[PDB]
């Protein structure tokens, strides 16, 4: 066994494109529409609950997720990838911030941590 | 330290004194010993003060992540299990002695936890240097089917026994009431029976009393423009 | 503690600090480390404070009994040896004593005896005892001469305690000066180290390292 | 220097308006072994004093003989031995206190904590403590060993200072003592259910009660307690 | 192993005035984290206008006081009812303490009264009998909390006269008995707040040419 | 080893270090140089446990020489002293700590100032006009406190140093076999061969 | 032997009306031997001030560590760290060395730049936070400081009055401690000005 | 602590006192020392409370995972898991555990695991500080194939004596009955057993 | 060692095992631990053999000299002499002695004197290392005013159990019967008491 | 104290004893005479624990002086050494033994012979041509073994003694502040004031 894929699966093509990132963006394009609007005294995020079946309970599938008491997230694209990112985002808000400073991270820094996780899946083996 | 926990009709109450000490010296005269693990799960700590605060924040942090992961409100038994397995792993070197109390979908709960990782169940419990003074009161006045008002009275009376009779305990009584189907109400400084009397004299000095060698402005601001 | 005593042309200078500590806690700044055995004899106190007080007061009683019986002033040699023989009987029991027995008689002249709780008894010209002894020795050794004036000798003893008071954490408070002559000792006052330090710094130009 | 072998636990006591109450259980422990169940640890001296003793029982028996000998000696050439020149609580205590401190000073202590309870000639309440170190103190409530930690807090709720003593009746005082003995039985691992209680009143004299038991105990709530955390059955 | 010593806590304070002296001490008696008594007198009138307290291990404290009171009695018998002067009492106490040099009374002793010129006097002793006349001396548990405050407020240490900026010290003006008692009460109130062994009650013995007077004050009981 | 002294005067730093090396009963050497040149204008003297002293000194030397080559630049005395402190501070919580006390005498060519740093085995750094380690200060500091001036010449500094050594030779029980004296200034490091 | 009392020294912090004050002695020693009279124990990162008593090597190390951490904080957060936040950082950093701790007694002091609220805090060597309203004390004369502060302190003192109170608290406490003294520094901190004053004291 | 397990005709009964001490202070006077590792496999705990709780929790986990895969475990299997933990970690444990269970095939079984981590299958077992005082009584009074009522009386009388003499034991006498019929909890208070 | 003394209707009976060990080696397997200090005052010895022999010899001397002057001593008097020696020399003794005697006025009496040197008058007493295992049995089975045969059976059964569990006890069970009729020695061998 | 040496030549005994007195950290004296004249032709040097040394030496002195007066006669060096040995042999099993080592250099006027006796604190007596106590012998005995002759003059003995002291000053870690040298011969006891 062992993970013998210790090399990058995303690489620069001759034209300078990173194929797997572009293809990931194509997968996002196929995904259901979600949006965000910022007001003076608040922010709103919204999306469609595209139910795969009417027998399915769409309330159990949360597309909009609480990350911290003051931060929320919504997505477009592959749901399972989102779900694990929310788990990692919630944990990293504690491990790399709340357990150090005794308070929840500001939006931009939590976003920065999420961005870092996504960057690493673009370069790691 | 004197900390107690008391079960009642529709929930549980915990209480604590507010004196933290360094040997025989009182470091803080109004310490907050009632800590929050989750909104409706609270605990009081005795022993090594850093260990009690550190272990409640860690388990409280993991409890929050667990609550988010499972989409369920946190349970006291989960806090209990996580605390005891952590403390057991460190074999008493983490000197945390806790009374854990709270409400959850299963009901109301009251546990004690010792530094080596052992846990106990009870309707009334006491921990800390004033635990014997407090337990004497609890053993004298506790009964089954206490009301909310009776439990708060009993709990605070048990802390008072520690405050007056135990040198390790003093100052004020903090209380937190966790009732089923309700928000937990934290009652900071529920009792204040130890206010210092006015001093005989004011020790405000005349300005210029202290001898000074040098003065200077300290630059706290960043490097300036232009 | 810092105590010193040295012989010179004009007799003996005795100088001591005034600090008493129990660990890091400064118990007192006004402690007397010169025991006035009698009007002619002085003793310094280092080590055990009670042991030095008790037994040097007792020594005064023995010296008084001697001159009543013999109709003659006791010699510094004899007085010092009464104390050293006494503490030697107690050797092992845990007495803690380091003292200079100082006096000025006809037959001996100015004489200093270092007496110890181990039973050591040493005659000498310069002695320094205590936690700050090394600091005082430096100032003494570099500035000492037999032909010092009483004024300069008094200052040297004062300055040497100041040196120790500054550097040694367990020395300070104030300086007590004595001048021992043949006709008896003469007290030369209590000098607060706090006030003395700044005074000496300015007038002497020393302690440039310290900001004043 | 020794170590205690057969030991007695808490002695508890308090002042009330007309006198003093003192109590102690009837156990002589041998380490964790509850060896002897019929040990009287309250020893009356005359009709005005009761000495309560905890700690080493062999030393208690020695002290018991000293007090017995003290009564004999006081009667010698003393026509007023049963009147003006009878033994006072204060005399008995000072004697014991002298002995205890002398013995600690020879590095061979009587390994005990003692409470002398009684009423003086003028009707004053006497209650004072002495132990193996010769340390003495007086208080409206006094207790030894575990009693100090658990009984005193309860007894001090009745008589918190000197001014509460005249307000406290013998019925209230006895009730508090009996409750304290129950609490000690719940919580002291070296205690027994059986105890003795002595009241020394300036009007009704010495009332010595033997073979008392802790009663009205709460245990029913134990049935509901299951496991140590997660267990339901 | 048997330990012949113990710590009964407590804190005492002696202050010498111009024509008076006070010796104060809290009335709390303790072992470890338990209170033995909220009122156990610690400062004693020993006769001949002398007040005494031997703070630390209470059994040795009581023993010493008892032996000194006894010494006052026998001083009267042996020397035609002569008054024992405070300096003579002090030297006598040194010998009582040094008598047990190799098995000491585990106490810090302080006595107070008037000297033979009628001025206020306080003497301070270590456990083995080294002693000294002092103007100001706190002893016991909260001594380290009280002495710095007294250096500042009685002797005006580190205090200078405004405008001069360190050049002129604040003058050492004499304090009245009412002024001293204020500093004593504030010393014990502060010590009670920050030291667990201090509290319950404060008993002050004031010595003047008229005799010995007592004053009692409540302290916090926690 | 035993005695190491340091004094910063007007335009130079002077380090005096004992020559004796004693292994218990016998004095094995009476000409030992307890110092290493870290850079052209930075000298470090040292004293402590046997082996650790030289091992540490040479390790520091190698690291500073490596830095000098990499950057083609001499680190300031302050920078070198901070590096050394960190190594000792790292060392004190190691499995087996370096038992070494050092003085760092350097001339800062940028600021045109002499600089003396005293660092003990715990990583306790202090910048001083004069310094010592072990018992050396107990004997010498009273003399230095008295005579020292910040505007002293190199020759005056050496005279005050002789007085310190004389006091040591008088009152110290151990025979430290005299001292090797070295001067650090703008022109670099040189040894005073007659002392 | 005891690491917290080898080098000696003290720090005290007090709150006043719209101001805080933090002060320290200047002594560094090797037990009985005085080594330095310029060893300052107070540091600042932006407007947040940190005093540290105890083992001097750890005082230096922790200062360098918190400079390091507050500099990275500022670069990422794009703002200076606040006293409340820094207090939690000090606590976290100390507790991560739970079974091999820095032998120190840190003291945080400052004013929150947004709320304007005066803030002080103290810690044990292992990270336990003491957030007192009135005053925080630390060092080898902490008992002496507790005694001085408890009697001298009163709430809502003006900056120039607070200076006198904290100065006298430090000075007289240090004079009853063998391992403290050799000079002293007092910081008077207001929302947008900080004054630093070196005190004249006895040098023994 | 006073604990015991006794096999009888219909199965097995576990018995225990309820006292937990810290020195001479009774930290808990209503402790439950009879703990469940499986439906009809229980244990009695003596020694370090932290250790025996930690062990019991791990065993319960192992038997739960065993049951998910291989169905109901035997009492012997439970005892083996206890032993494995106690034996391999003997240097860091202070645990004296009695394991008792009911199979339909094997019926009532009792295994005792003392400090060393050895295993001993017995008709009945006694353990804890208070057991020392009842070795004589239990050996004289135990019979095989007793009835439920006789076994309850045997345990009640035995632990009554252990409690009477051992200061570390006391409180209520808890019992758990394991048979084909199911699991029955019993409790007996001081006023009942002290007069025996 | 396993020793006991039991009062009954006609007087008192002393009982003891016969094992004396040096570590795990049985130095003497036929020891007589029932020793005579007077005609009808005997004692059971436990602890240091040297100490208890030395004490018993001194007591016998004291009671012999007592008898020469004041006539036959009471059992209480004998116990007092034992106590005086054990209490005053408690620092240098390791002795646990049970004193048993028969007067005509007082009949059978038993006094136990443990390590500390205290005295306890009891209806019956048990002592020695093996006594720990029979506290439960003896407490349940003892009755006052038993017959000679019942008391012999009680002691035999009790010491049988003490011997069974205590490695420091063993050999034969010796007994001495003290009544108005006189002094009777009894012995019971392993083959007899082991099958009980 | 530290170093005491002895050498018996043709017609005299020479004792060399160090001048230093060290109390832990400081050298309190550098002119201490570690010897007592017991009789006109008998000298005793001594080294050991502080206090005990002088107390013992003076006690012996008093006893020999008492004997001299009572009998109007000087005891032989052998007789004095036997008396001293017995006192030390008595001392070693006492409650608190004298921790003192001595050399006894005497001239026997009857036999016209110099005599050197070495006695340690246990009461171990040996008559020797040359002797020492403590570590002194470790450094010096190889030189004495090589150069010593029984027919040496006093001047040659002093030269060999200088060589021993030079070797001590080179290889010993402690500074013993030189030695006081005394000669015992038919004319009595005299001190060599320049050494
Ligand atoms: Mg004498
Ligand atoms: Mg309290
Ligand atoms: Mg100083
Ligand atoms: Mg023996
Ligand atoms: Mg056997
Ligand atoms: Mg020899």
Curated annotation (Swiss-Prot), chain A:
Keyword Cytoplasm: yes
Glycyl lysine isopeptide (Lys-Gly) (interchain with G-Cter in ubiquitin) cross-link, chain position(s): 108
Any single Gene Ontology cellular-component annotation: proteasome storage granule
One of the GO biological process terms: proteasomal ubiquitin-independent protein catabolic process
Localization annotation: Cytoplasm; Nucleus
UniProt keyword terms in alphabetical order: Cytoplasm, Isopeptide bond, Nucleus, Proteasome, Ubl conjugation
Top-level lineage group: Eukaryota
Major localization class: cytoplasm
Other comments on record: Present with 7060 molecules/cell in log phase SD medium.
Function: The proteasome degrades poly-ubiquitinated proteins in the cytoplasm and in the nucleus. It is essential for the regulated turnover of proteins and for the removal of misfolded proteins. The proteasome is a multicatalytic proteinase complex that is characterized by its ability to cleave peptides with Arg, Phe, Tyr, Leu, and Glu adjacent to the leaving group at neutral or slightly basic pH. It has an ATP-dependent proteolytic activity.
Family named by the database record: Belongs to the peptidase T1A family.
Complexes and interactors: The 26S proteasome consists of a 20S proteasome core and two 19S regulatory subunits. The 20S proteasome core is composed of 28 subunits that are arranged in four stacked rings, resulting in a barrel-shaped structure. The two end rings are each formed by seven alpha subunits, and the two central rings are each formed by seven beta subunits. The catalytic chamber with the active sites is on the inside of the barrel.
UniProt-recorded name of the protein: Proteasome subunit alpha type-2
Gene designation per UniProt: PRE8
Complete-protein stretch covered: 1 to 125 of 250
Swiss-Prot record, chain D:
Biological process according to GO: proteasomal ubiquitin-independent protein catabolic process; proteasome assembly; proteasome-mediated ubiquitin-dependent protein catabolic process
Membrane-spanning parts: none
Main location: cytoplasm
Keyword match Ribosomal protein: no
Subcellular location: Cytoplasm; Nucleus
One Pfam family from the record: Proteasome
Secretion signal, residue range per the UniProt entry: none
InterPro entries given in the database record: Ntn_hydrolases_N, Proteasome_beta4, Proteasome_bsu_CS, Proteasome_sua/b, Proteasome_suB-type
Key words, A-Z: Cytoplasm, Nucleus, Proteasome
GO cellular component: cytosol; nucleus; proteasome complex; proteasome core complex, beta-subunit complex; proteasome storage granule
Biological role stated in the UniProt entry: Non-catalytic component of the proteasome which degrades poly-ubiquitinated proteins in the cytoplasm and in the nucleus. It is essential for the regulated turnover of proteins and for the removal of misfolded proteins. The proteasome is a multicatalytic proteinase complex that is characterized by its ability to cleave peptides with Arg, Phe, Tyr, Leu, and Glu adjacent to the leaving group at neutral or slightly basic pH. It has an ATP-dependent proteolytic activity. PRE3 and PRE4 are necessary for the peptidyl-glutamyl-peptide-hydrolyzing activity.
Entry's family note: Belongs to the peptidase T1B family.
Note: Present with 16900 molecules/cell in log phase SD medium.
Name the UniProt record assigns to this protein: Proteasome subunit beta type-7
Lineage: Eukaryota, Fungi, Dikarya, Ascomycota, Saccharomycotina
Gene this chain is encoded by: PRE4
Curated annotation (Swiss-Prot), chain E:
Main subcellular location: cytoplasm
InterPro entries found in the cross-reference section: Ntn_hydrolases_N, Proteasome_bsu_CS, Proteasome_sua/b, Proteasome_suB-type
Pfam families: Proteasome (PF00227)
Subcellular location: Cytoplasm; Nucleus
Role, per record: Non-catalytic component of the proteasome which degrades poly-ubiquitinated proteins in the cytoplasm and in the nucleus. It is essential for the regulated turnover of proteins and for the removal of misfolded proteins. The proteasome is a multicatalytic proteinase complex that is characterized by its ability to cleave peptides with Arg, Phe, Tyr, Leu, and Glu adjacent to the leaving group at neutral or slightly basic pH. It has an ATP-dependent proteolytic activity.
Family membership: Belongs to the peptidase T1B family.
SUBUNIT field: The 26S proteasome consists of a 20S proteasome core and two 19S regulatory subunits. The 20S proteasome core is composed of 28 subunits that are arranged in four stacked rings, resulting in a barrel-shaped structure. The two end rings are each formed by seven alpha subunits, and the two central rings are each formed by seven beta subunits. The catalytic chamber with the active sites is on the inside of the barrel.
Protein's name according to its UniProt entry: Proteasome subunit beta type-6
Species for this entry: Saccharomyces cerevisiae (strain ATCC 204508 / S288c)
Gene encoding the protein: PRE7
UniProtKB/Swiss-Prot annotation, chains F, J:
Main location: cytoplasm
Keyword annotations from UniProtKB, A to Z: Acetylation, Cytoplasm, Nucleus, Phosphoprotein, Proteasome
SUPFAM superfamilies assigned: N-terminal nucleophile aminohydrolases (Ntn hydrolases)
Modified residues (N-acetylmethionine): 1
Keyword Phosphoprotein attributed: yes
GO cellular component: a single term: proteasome complex
InterPro entries documented for this protein: Ntn_hydrolases_N, Proteasome_beta2, Proteasome_bsu_CS, Proteasome_sua/b, Proteasome_suB-type
Subunit structure: The 26S proteasome consists of a 20S proteasome core and two 19S regulatory subunits. The 20S proteasome core is composed of 28 subunits that are arranged in four stacked rings, resulting in a barrel-shaped structure. The two end rings are each formed by seven alpha subunits, and the two central rings are each formed by seven beta subunits. The catalytic chamber with the active sites is on the inside of the barrel.
PANTHER family attached to this UniProt entry: METALLOPROTEASE TLDD, PROTEASOME SUBUNIT BETA TYPE-1
UniProt protein name: Proteasome subunit beta type-4
